[PDB]
Write a protein that binds this ligand. Structure first.
Ligand code: NAD
Ligand code: NAD
Lengths: 200, 204
């Protein structure tokens, strides 16, 4: 699955950066916090091409999963909201190195429009969001606006032809395009549930 | 006699009860929960009997009572103490997140190794502390959750220090797998972008 494929990809990529050639299912099981039977079952999708002896060829799986995930493609991004989240994301320098290029950032606050959210990036007026998205063919919109305005902002991106939405606002966006939510509070909540379970 | 429902199904009830409240449902039946949670109606009644009559209203279950009683069991009414390690883009944005205290999470300290950042305000009322005192601060204040907002190359090191200081859990923003004896929730923005783009291409 997508989340599981990405999890394998991040692990194997760190493994290649270290320089490791072969990784065992048990090392994968520990690194991914998964069962060794599931590690072998998931990776059996790549057949004997993904294995070297008892272990797994790190570069083969990394290249094969990178192909599935389409990691060679670059993506145009816009960030709606020049607040805490929007600026932190816009200033993540290596994001462009991973193939995700933020080319526009928008906000409805006159004090911040015209300011520099990041080197080479100027906050634009959210009134020009649809025009900017259609003109530049932006594929992914990053919603860093409040939860009340999130559905509206999402509708604006969808009407303007956005292909996907990365949503930081704590609300279930109702829209046709794929949405990936980063809910920091919910992630903290999920963590607490596991904390309560272990200390019960 | 009536056993406490396991955490995994408590969480399932909680999220289902949350959706019901958003829909405006005040009373829900065992069969509706059986349908929405894919469980035996018999099992729904055995699980919810843990909350006695307090969980029930009329012909069904009191959604509000169950949401708050299950949330209480899951620590939703408990104000969790957080520290943030790393006072950069992520750490400052998390430290500046206004209403997180209202949601139940209070950052009482933020730490960094940069002497140019230490002693400045990461957020109004919050001073960047020297990461040298990280363990002592966590132990003294009984900090539960550590938010790792440092670069990946130092993330494992920070996690072990939090672990040694008795941290209960870790929210990790650094794109690495953390190996510690406490639970870890990863938030990987790049991974989330990769999931999103894969689903975009999948629809074609
Ligand atoms: N910062 C966190 O750690 C955190 C945690 C959990 C959730 N979130 C969610 O992430 C989102 C962003 O939070 P933040 O901390 O960056 O908020 P923030 O207040 O710092 O920034 C929000 C920005 O959105 C802008 N904005 C508001 N309405 C707009 C509109 N219609 N069009 C364009 N811009 C608009 C505001 O001017 C502001 O600059 C929020 O929805 C928040 O609930 C953030
Ligand atoms: N900003 C994003 O959008 C984004 C996206 C994906 C991942 N991340 C990950 O989140 C983490 C933080 O990102 P950021 O953009 O805030 O980075 P940043 O460089 O802005 O913050 C790093 C901070 O950590 C501090 N630090 C470094 N080593 C430390 C140590 N041993 N102890 C304490 N503090 C230390 C630095 O002084 C710096 O202030 C990184 O791991 C990054 O890869 C961030």
């Amino acid at each position: 699955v997508s989340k599981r494929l990405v999890s394998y990809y991040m692990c194997l990529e760190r493994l290649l950066d270290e320089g490791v050639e072969v990784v065992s299912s048990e090392e994968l099981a520990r690194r991914l916090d998964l069962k060794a039977s599931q590690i072998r079952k998931d990776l059996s999708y790549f057949g004997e091409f993904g294995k070297r002896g008892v272990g797994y060829n790190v570069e083969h799986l990394y290249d094969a999963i990178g192909e599935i995930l389409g990691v060679k493609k670059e993506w145009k991004l816009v960030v709606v909201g020049a607040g805490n989240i929007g600026r932190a994301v816009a200033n993540y320098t290596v994001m462009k190195e991973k193939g995700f290029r933020i080319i526009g950032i928008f906000d409805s606050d006159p004090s911040k429009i015209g300011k520099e959210a990041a080197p080479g990036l100027t906050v634009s007026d959210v009134s020009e969001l649809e025009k900017f998205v259609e003109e530049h063919g932006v594929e992914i919109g990053v919603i860093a606006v409040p939860a009340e305005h999130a559905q509206e902002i999402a509708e604006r991106l969808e009407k303007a032809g956005i292909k996907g939405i990365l949503n930081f606002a704590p609300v279930k966006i109702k829209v046709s395009v794929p949405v990936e939510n980063i809910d920091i509070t919910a992630s903290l909540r999920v963590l607490t549930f596991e904390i309560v379970r272990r200390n019960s």
